[PDB]
Ligand SMILES: OCc1cccc(-c2cncnc2)c1
């Protein structure tokens with residue numbers, strides 16, 4: 001019926017159908033369009049107090065809760081989707097990953113290299129697509145597939 005991981009849902013506030021991907025946590029109004037050895041992705045990471053290493057170049061001691069980190073991620077997603085801010089700009093300023101210095105770019109990678117929820121979301125994204133919040137032991141990610 002639909003590409004890998006998509007399903008139909010109904011908006012609670014408008015009653016309009018929309019589509020949700022349970023691998024990438026992406027959601028959109030339009031019916032999704034239409035696997036490679038490698039993909040290239042950027043990401044924006046927001047760590048929390050239960051992250052494997054609760055520290056980053058932004059903060060020596062990361063104390064925000066998981067729920068607070070999800071609220072920050074959700075806000076970044078809203079501004080990217082509105083065009084008020086670019087993904088690269090938010091990643092450079094606010095990602096808790098060292099890759100912030102490269103606008104979030106991780107380069108290319110194969111299956112078996114990244115943490116599994118990150119890998120699965122990366123490979124389920126189509127080129128140019130953005131994930132919703134993706135949870136790993138490092139924290140919460142927004143993933144952008146660039147190649
Ligand atoms: O630390 C700077 C830097 C630059 C470029 C790549 C990495 C890296 C990190 N972890 C796994 N693989 C590659 C790190």
Ligand SMILES: OCc1cccc(-c2cncnc2)c1
Nearest residue numbers: 098099100101102105106107
């Ligand atoms: O897995 C690749 C990887 C992982 C984590 C960080 C990087 C990176 C890239 N560019 C600049 N700084 C850090 C790359």
